[PDB]
Amino acid sequence: GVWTNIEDEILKASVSKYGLNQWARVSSLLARKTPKQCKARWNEWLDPSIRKIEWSKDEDEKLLHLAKLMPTQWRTIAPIVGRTANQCLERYQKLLDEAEAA
């Protein structure tokens, strides 16, 4: 289900305690969140290396050049555009959705 501003605060404080690679203990301090869901939420949001600002179109153009160059791998675009792979895939679909509408 959804992630509340409270559950992320418990996730951050729990991650600081048991590190990464310890998600059953991390999940234990949560009520209705699986260990995998905690890994997802830190890998897609809580990690401070993930960007929080809107996509710059400098980042959109970087994403467009590399998706046409290498459509055979998505975890390959990510180490160059400072976002996650799953964020890259979904942002590319939006840029395709917006083009299709025009």
Curated annotation (Swiss-Prot):
Record-annotated DNA-binding residue ranges: 23-46, 74-96
Signal peptide: none
Superkingdom: Eukaryota
Cellular location(s): Cytoplasm; Nucleus
Domain HTH myb-type residue range list: 1-50, 51-100
Subunit structure, interactors included: Associated with the spliceosome.
Functional description taken from the UniProt entry: Involved in pre-mRNA splicing and cell cycle control.
Similarity field: Belongs to the CEF1 family.
Name this polypeptide is given: Pre-mRNA-splicing factor CEF1
Organism of origin: Pyricularia oryzae (strain 70-15 / ATCC MYA-4617 / FGSC 8958)
Part of the intact protein present: 7 to 106 of 773
